[PDB]
C-alpha cells in the first residue's frame, strides 16, 4: 500500500493538449490499486510519474508526466484526485526556491509546519488563494514571495511564528 | 515507512563538523528508526538519514546524509545506512554521472536488471570495478557519463539496455 507515498492534489486531473503524449487507463475498485501499479510500474509502456483516480467512474489514469510537464494542464473535477510520484517532483531548490513544489513540511529545527489554510497557532495573510501558482497547500515549506532565506513555513510551535526549512540547493559548487 | 529510504548495507556516517546535531536511542528494529525519522518526532532537526546498529540495536538519526559536506561514509558490518529519499537529489545535472537516486525503471517502462546479475544480459559493469559510482541494486546509473543520462540493463531479454526517464534539474521552472 504505497498511496501515502504520493503527493495528492484533490479535485484535480490532468489533460494532454499535445495528443502525442501517452496514457493508460483501467477500471478498478480503489485509489490504492492505482498507486500499487504506478509504484511497481507493472504493465505500463512508460515511466509512471503520476496517476488520477476518478471516484465516479472508478478508473485509474496512469501518466508518463505530471502537473509540471510541458504540454499538460490541470483540470478541475469533483470526482478526481491527482497523485504525483515524488521521484518526479524536484526535491532540491533552484535559487531561492520560489518554484519549489516538493513535500518537505518540517523546519530546520525539526518543527512541524502549520498548514497555510490555518490561522492556528499563527494568524497570517499567506492565503492559498492570494498566492496562486505558489502551491501553498497542506503544510509544505514554500517561498511564495521569493525571499532570500529559501522555503519556510509558519510553525506549529506557538512560540516560533516562522522558520526556514532545510532544503538543499540542486547545484552549488 | 522504511521503503521511503535508500538502504546502503554495511555503512555508517561520521561527522567532521562537530556542530552538526545527532540523536541516538536504543531501539528494537531498523523499522522503528524509520518511523521516528519519517514522523520527525522528538528530533531537534530535519531527519535526512539514520543508521541502525544491528549489534547494539541503536538508531542514530542525522540532519545530513552521505552527500552532505562535513561527513564521511565508512564501512562497518553491523551498520545499515538509510537515507531519506526527499534529500537525495532526484534530478540530473549534466549527464547524470553523480545521480544516486532510486529510480529503477527505463523510459519505456521496463524494470531494470540488477547490476550484479548477468541474466538476461551479460556485462562488464561490475560494482567493485566501479567503486564510487553506486552500481547497487537495479538503479538507473551513468557510470561513464554517456549522452542520454542514467540507464540500465533491462529485465526484458530483447532490450539489452535503455535510458531511464530522470528529468534534468533544468527541465522545470
Ligand atoms: O510573519 C509574517 O507574517 C511574515 C511571513 C514571513 C516570514 C519570513 C518572511 O515573511
Residue numbers in the entry:
A (entry chain B): 37 to 209
B (entry chain A): 38 to 210
The publication says:
Two truncated forms of HGF/SF are produced by alternative splicing of the primary transcript: NK1 encodes the N domain and the first K domain (K1),16 while NK2 encodes the N, K1 and K2 domains. NK1 is a monomer in solution, but crystallises as a head-to-tail dimer and all available crystal structures of human and mouse NK1 yielded the same dimer.
MB605 consists of two parts, a furan and a propanoic acid moiety, resembling HEPES. In comparison to HEPES, MB605 forms stronger polar interactions and hydrogen bonds to E183 via the furan ring, as well as additional polar interactions to R181. The furan ring packs tightly in the aromatic part of the pocket, stacking against W188 and resting perpendicular to Y198. In this orientation, MB605 is able to make π–π interaction to W188 and Y198. MB605 is a very small molecule (140 Da) but displays about ten times better affinity for NK1 than HEPES and can be grown towards the glycine loop gaining the chemical space occupied by the ethylene glycol molecule in the current crystal structure and enabling hydrogen bonding to the glycine loop with significant affinity gain.
